[PDB]
Point group: C3
Chain length 151, copies 3
Amino acid sequence: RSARVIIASTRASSGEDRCGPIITEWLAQQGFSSAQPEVVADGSPVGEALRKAIDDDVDVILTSGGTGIAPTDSTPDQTVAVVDYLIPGLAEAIRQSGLPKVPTSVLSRGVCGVAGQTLIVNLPGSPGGVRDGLGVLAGVLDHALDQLAGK
Amino acid sequence: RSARVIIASTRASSGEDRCGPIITEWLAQQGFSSAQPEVVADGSPVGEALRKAIDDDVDVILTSGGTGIAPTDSTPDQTVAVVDYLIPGLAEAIRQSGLPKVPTSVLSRGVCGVAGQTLIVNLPGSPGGVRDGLGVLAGVLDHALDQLAGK
Amino acid sequence: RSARVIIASTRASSGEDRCGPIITEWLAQQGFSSAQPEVVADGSPVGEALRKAIDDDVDVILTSGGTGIAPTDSTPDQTVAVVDYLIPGLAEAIRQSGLPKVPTSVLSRGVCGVAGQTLIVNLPGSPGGVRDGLGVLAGVLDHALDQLAGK
């Protein structure tokens, strides 16, 4: 029942992350043990934070930020590079949870995937997007982790 | 108007498949001619059963099983390896047909695609998922086959 | 605020395109400047028309046609070959806009993506599909272009 949180934000990694605390709280509410979230710059540092977490063999890695189409948004690409495979239906459920209230939800490129025995979920970079996505994870995360482990 | 059914289940291929009969029945109801379903183990045997079916030049191949995130679920990967291209909107429609009743529907990695003149559809591995997916195919399969053939 | 329109149709490129005028009108209504739409044959000519447009450094390229599963429908493949990355949530929103009225909407393989500073959107090849898709673009296109440019 272990988790890691990574906040992808160059803006926040050098000087405020609001999404970390929200995710930490949700994980505690949901019974997960987790370290303080790693706040890292966009790009290669996301890939590195991911690799560190996977090497920790945690059950789930939740990222927030860097999933839009802005020049520096490379969280999904960094994530694709470390997973064994993707789960596009989960990423689409997370997008759709922002709909129809935030039409721009369809612009998130966030992916979900599995590296070994670790589920990885890209959440959006806003607190409202994060809550939306976590609401989706609440309905499935337990079953996913169990299905991942093989009942 | 030809079809092939492949059941991807190591559990069923060595000792009960409930999904085969359902699919066979739906195909008969829908006017398709088809051979008895091939029940095969997860992994390479799915890829082989697929290649055999494509070489039979059937119009449609329906698979059931091995589309989740459990360690041995490699039907989508075996399918990606044999198709010329994918049809992600059809695979998403099939996932969404399980919603909102079975939230875990979003975990299916099943794909749809075309190999030459053969449409391939990954269905879920449960009988209820299969019925859900077949209900989606009922609204489009005829048109798809026709669009595939070029009116 | 610049745009380019490409109509992918071998049928129309040799002898009537109804989708071009619709898109041109929508772009004018939405404040975009744009050249007369390029009508081109399926395949390599779509890729070429795309490259020409990207080299023009326009803000948005809208294509119509060649997104189904018929043998010659290669607009999405030509588009994947020129973009730096894809935006699958936008392409799914466009498919879903045809639903539930036109169940075959799920068969469109159209993609959306970014080449450098240029957003590219594959629309369907029918006038009703085009209107459906443009209705989706109306809710997000401005924000997308802005997010693309970095606020």
